[PDB]
Structure formats: structure tokens, C-alpha cells
PDB file of C-alpha atoms in Angstrom:
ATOM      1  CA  UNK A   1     123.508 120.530 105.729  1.00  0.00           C
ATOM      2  CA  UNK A   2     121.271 117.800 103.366  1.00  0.00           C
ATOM      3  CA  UNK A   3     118.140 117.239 103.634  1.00  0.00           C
ATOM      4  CA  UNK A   4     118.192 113.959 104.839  1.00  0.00           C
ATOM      5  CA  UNK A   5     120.831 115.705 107.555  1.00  0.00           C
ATOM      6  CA  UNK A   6     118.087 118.233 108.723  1.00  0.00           C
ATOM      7  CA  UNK A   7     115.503 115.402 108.444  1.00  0.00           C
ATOM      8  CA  UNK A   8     117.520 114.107 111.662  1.00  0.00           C
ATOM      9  CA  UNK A   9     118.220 117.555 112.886  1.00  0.00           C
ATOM     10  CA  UNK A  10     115.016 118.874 112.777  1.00  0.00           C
ATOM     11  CA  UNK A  11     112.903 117.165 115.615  1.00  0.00           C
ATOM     12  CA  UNK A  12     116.407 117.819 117.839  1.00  0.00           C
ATOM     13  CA  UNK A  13     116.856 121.611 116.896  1.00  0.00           C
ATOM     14  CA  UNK A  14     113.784 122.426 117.003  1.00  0.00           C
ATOM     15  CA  UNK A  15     111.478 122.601 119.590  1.00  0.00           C
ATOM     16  CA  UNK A  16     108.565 120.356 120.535  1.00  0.00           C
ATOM     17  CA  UNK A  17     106.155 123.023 121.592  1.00  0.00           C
ATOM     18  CA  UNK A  18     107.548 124.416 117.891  1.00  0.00           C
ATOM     19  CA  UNK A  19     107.134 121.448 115.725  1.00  0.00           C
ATOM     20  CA  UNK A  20     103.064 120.729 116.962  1.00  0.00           C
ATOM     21  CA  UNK A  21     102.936 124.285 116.161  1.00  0.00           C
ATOM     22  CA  UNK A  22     104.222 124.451 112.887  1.00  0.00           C
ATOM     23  CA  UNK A  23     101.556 121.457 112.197  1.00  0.00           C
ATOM     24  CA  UNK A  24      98.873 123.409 113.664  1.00  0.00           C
ATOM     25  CA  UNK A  25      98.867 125.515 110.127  1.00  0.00           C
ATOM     26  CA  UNK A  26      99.738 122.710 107.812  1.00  0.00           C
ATOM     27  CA  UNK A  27      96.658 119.801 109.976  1.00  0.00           C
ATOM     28  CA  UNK A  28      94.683 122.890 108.579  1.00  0.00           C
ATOM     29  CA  UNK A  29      95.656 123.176 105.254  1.00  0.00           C
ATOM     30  CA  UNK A  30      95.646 119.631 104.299  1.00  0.00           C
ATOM     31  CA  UNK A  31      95.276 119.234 100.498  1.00  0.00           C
ATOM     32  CA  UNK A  32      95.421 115.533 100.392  1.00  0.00           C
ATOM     33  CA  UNK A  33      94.135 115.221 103.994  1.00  0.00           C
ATOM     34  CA  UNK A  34      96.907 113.252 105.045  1.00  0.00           C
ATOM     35  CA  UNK A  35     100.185 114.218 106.208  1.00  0.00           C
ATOM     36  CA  UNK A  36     100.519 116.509 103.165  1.00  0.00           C
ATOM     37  CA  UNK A  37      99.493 119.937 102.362  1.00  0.00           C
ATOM     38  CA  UNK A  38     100.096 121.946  98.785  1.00  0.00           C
ATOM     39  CA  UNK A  39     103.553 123.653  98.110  1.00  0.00           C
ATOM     40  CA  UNK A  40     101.367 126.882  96.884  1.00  0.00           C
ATOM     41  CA  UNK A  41      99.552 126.236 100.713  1.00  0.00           C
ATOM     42  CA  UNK A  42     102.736 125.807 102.418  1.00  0.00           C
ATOM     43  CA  UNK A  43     103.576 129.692 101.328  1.00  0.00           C
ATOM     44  CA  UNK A  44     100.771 130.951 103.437  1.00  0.00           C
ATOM     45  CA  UNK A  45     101.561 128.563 106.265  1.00  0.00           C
ATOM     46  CA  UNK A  46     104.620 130.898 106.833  1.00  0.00           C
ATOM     47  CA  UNK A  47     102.862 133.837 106.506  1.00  0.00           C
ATOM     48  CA  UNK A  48      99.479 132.769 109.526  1.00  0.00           C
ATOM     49  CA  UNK A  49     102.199 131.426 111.787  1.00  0.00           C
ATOM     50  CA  UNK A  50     104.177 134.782 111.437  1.00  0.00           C
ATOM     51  CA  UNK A  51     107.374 133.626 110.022  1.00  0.00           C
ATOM     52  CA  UNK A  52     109.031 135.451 106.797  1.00  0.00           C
ATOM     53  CA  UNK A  53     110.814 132.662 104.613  1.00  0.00           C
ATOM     54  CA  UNK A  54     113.479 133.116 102.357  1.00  0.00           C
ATOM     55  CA  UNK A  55     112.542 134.047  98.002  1.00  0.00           C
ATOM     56  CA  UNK A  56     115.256 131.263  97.590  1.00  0.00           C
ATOM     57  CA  UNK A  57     112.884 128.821 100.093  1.00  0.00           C
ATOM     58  CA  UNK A  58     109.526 130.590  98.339  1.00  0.00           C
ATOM     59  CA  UNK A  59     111.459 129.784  94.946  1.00  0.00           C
ATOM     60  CA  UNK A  60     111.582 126.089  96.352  1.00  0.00           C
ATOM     61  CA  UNK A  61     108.036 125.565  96.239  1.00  0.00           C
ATOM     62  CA  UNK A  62     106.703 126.470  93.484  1.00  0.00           C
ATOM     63  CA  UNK A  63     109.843 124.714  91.436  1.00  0.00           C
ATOM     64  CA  UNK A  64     108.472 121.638  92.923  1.00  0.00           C
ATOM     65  CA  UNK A  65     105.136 122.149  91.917  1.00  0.00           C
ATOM     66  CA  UNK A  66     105.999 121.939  88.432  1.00  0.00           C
ATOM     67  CA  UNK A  67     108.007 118.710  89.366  1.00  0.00           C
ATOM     68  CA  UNK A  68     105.120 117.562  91.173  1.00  0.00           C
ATOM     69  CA  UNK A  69     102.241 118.366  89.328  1.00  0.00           C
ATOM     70  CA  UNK A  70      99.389 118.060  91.797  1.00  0.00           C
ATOM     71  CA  UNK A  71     101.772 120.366  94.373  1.00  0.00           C
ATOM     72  CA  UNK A  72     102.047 118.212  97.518  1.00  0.00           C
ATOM     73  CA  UNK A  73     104.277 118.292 100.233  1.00  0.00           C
ATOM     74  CA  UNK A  74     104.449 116.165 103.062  1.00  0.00           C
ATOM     75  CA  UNK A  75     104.955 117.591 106.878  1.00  0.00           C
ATOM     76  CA  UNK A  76     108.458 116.050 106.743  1.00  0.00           C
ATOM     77  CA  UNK A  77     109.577 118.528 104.094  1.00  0.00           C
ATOM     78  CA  UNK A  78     107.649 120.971 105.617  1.00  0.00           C
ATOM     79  CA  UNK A  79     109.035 120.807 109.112  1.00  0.00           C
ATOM     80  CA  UNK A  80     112.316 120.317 107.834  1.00  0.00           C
ATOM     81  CA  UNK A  81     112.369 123.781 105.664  1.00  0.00           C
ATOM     82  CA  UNK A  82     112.146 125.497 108.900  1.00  0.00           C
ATOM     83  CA  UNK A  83     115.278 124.340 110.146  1.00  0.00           C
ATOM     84  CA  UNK A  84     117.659 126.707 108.296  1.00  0.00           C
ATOM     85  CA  UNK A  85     114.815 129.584 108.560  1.00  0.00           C
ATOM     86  CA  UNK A  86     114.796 129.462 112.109  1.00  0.00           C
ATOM     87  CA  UNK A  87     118.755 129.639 111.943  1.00  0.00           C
ATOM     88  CA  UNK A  88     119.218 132.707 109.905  1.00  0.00           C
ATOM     89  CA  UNK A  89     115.854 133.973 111.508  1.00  0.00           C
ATOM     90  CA  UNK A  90     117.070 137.275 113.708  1.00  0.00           C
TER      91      UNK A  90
END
């Protein structure tokens, strides 16, 4: 599925109890202080949260922060990255 696709299915596959706690680790790790957090940051968020993302999704970040140059990421992206980890997760 696109992005934009899993922009849509993302609030709707995913849990709400999930989604507020996905933001618990990025509302902490805000770079920009609003609504965005660093793609280097967003690494770790996986890792405090205890979720193991793919070196294809890890890959994804730090591509971008050469694209990007001061490395942010909104929650959108964020949130929407865990769709397809949470579908090939166990």
C-alpha cells in the first residue's frame, strides 16, 4: 500500500490506545517541538517502546536525512511507518 493509503489506514488499523502510545516516545523526543521529532530520534523511538523495525525501514530514515538536511519527521510519517511493522510484526 502508498503512503498516502496507510496515511488513511493507519488511525483505522491501528489502535487508539496504540497510536497515543506510539506519541508518548516521539511528544518526548521532539526536535522541533512541534509535531516533529528527528529521523536519527525516530530510530530509538522503536527501540524505548520495544518494537524491532525493519534495516529496510532503519535504511528509510537516515536516506531522508540526507534529503532533509535538518532530519525531521513529522508524527504523521511516524505513525504511519508502523503500519506495515505491526503487520509483519510476529
Amino acid at each position: 500500500a502508498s503512503m498516502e493509503d496507510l496515511q488513511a489506514e493507519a488511525r483505522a488499523f491501528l489502535s487508539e490506545e496504540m497510536i497515543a502510545e506510539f506519541k508518548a516516545a516521539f511528544d518526548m523526543f521532539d526536535a522541533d517541538g512541534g509535531g516533529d521529532i528527528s529521523y536519527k530520534a525516530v530510530g530509538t523511538v522503536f527501540r524505548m517502546l520495544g518494537i524491532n523495525p525493519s534495516k529496510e525501514v532503519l535504511d528509510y530514515l537516515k536516506e531522508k536525512i540526507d534529503v532533509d538536511g535538518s532530519g525531521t519527521i513529522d508524527f504523521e510519517e511516524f505513525l504511519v511507518l508502523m503500519v506495515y511493522i505491526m503487520k509483519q510484526d510476529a
